[PDB]
């Protein structure tokens, strides 16, 4: 299962077809025979396997880590701060990429479920996609291959100094 909070669904909408025919309805005959002749034995087998696995219980824990401070609270060369600093940063980097993946899967689900009216009621999800990806583009983009942490902070300092000079000139 999942968290429907973080994977939202639009509320369900289904009508009932009302013939207004006299052939009638072959596919209803087929889907009833399908349910009785396919969906029954797999239901029984899943019952069997559920008992055979719930007879004894395992658990797998979601791994969680602490928060070792920063690169900005680390000294000159002095590796034993920088090491924890960079592994903390790189684990944030991987979880940040997967956040981008989750936003994109929401966007695909909105494309398929909203149908051929594209620009109807995906635009808030499109809005937050362009917001988060403006952040990602501004923050992790043009560092290249050997990103460690130091180029990241260099991009940070240089970016906000450029913006500071820009707002100083604009005022």
């Amino acid at each position: 299962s999942w968290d429907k909070d973080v994977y939202p669904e639009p509320p369900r909408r289904t009508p009932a077809p009302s013939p207004q025919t006299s052939l009638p309805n072959p596919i209803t005959y087929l889907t009833k025979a399908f349910d009785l002749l396919v969906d029954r034995p797999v239901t029984l087998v899943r019952e069997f396997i559920e008992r055979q696995h719930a007879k004894n219980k395992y658990y797998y824990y979601h791994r969680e880590f602490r928060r070792v401070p920063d690169i900005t609270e680390c000294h000159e060369k002095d590796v034993l701060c920088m090491f924890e600093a960079e592994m903390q940063w790189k684990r944030d980097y991987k979880v940040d990429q997967e956040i981008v993946n989750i936003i994109q899967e929401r966007l695909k689900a909105c494309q398929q479920r909203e149908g051929e009216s594209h620009r109807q009621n995906c635009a808030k999800e499109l809005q937050q996609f362009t917001q988060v990806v403006k952040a990602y583009q501004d923050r992790y983009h043009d560092l290249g291959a050997h990103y460690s942490a130091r180029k990241c902070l260099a991009k940070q300092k240089q970016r906000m100094l450029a913006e500071r000079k820009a707002t100083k000139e604009a005022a």
């Binding site: 609270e73 000294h75 002095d78």
Partner: protein, 119 residues
């Protein structure tokens, strides 16, 4: 780097060399030396046409013994030489505080280095 008490004659191992830790039994370097000695006895069989691995077992034991011994003395001398080099370095550190000043740790909240992106 020069002697440093060649005054104070040649003295293959000084009597100040009986404070360092000795090389232990079956330390891996003299194990390598013994392997080299075994191989030396083996090629010693191999030069002449006497057969390998056999008919020379006293010579194999001889070459093993002699090379392990010589390597043992040189391991003791080697450890002494690095000890005297470290102690002279730290003595010249402590002798003059005036020329090796303490680099105050400019932590990275204030250190400025530019970016130069690889696109």
């Amino acid at each position: 780097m020069t002697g440093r008490q060649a005054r104070a004659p040649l003295q293959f191992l000084p009597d100040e060399a009986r404070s360092l830790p000795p090389p232990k039994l079956t330390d891996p370097r003299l194990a390598y030396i013994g392997f080299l000695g075994y191989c030396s006895g083996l090629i010693d069989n191999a030069i002449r046409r006497r057969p390998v691995l056999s008919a020379g077992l006293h010579r194999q034991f001889l070459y093993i013994t002699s090379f392990v011994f010589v390597g043992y003395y040189l391991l003791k001398r080697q450890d002494y030489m690095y000890a005297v080099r470290d102690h002279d370095m730290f003595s010249y550190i402590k002798s003059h505080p005036e020329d090796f000043p303490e680099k105050d740790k400019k932590t990275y909240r204030e250190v400025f280095e530019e970016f130069h992106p690889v696109r």
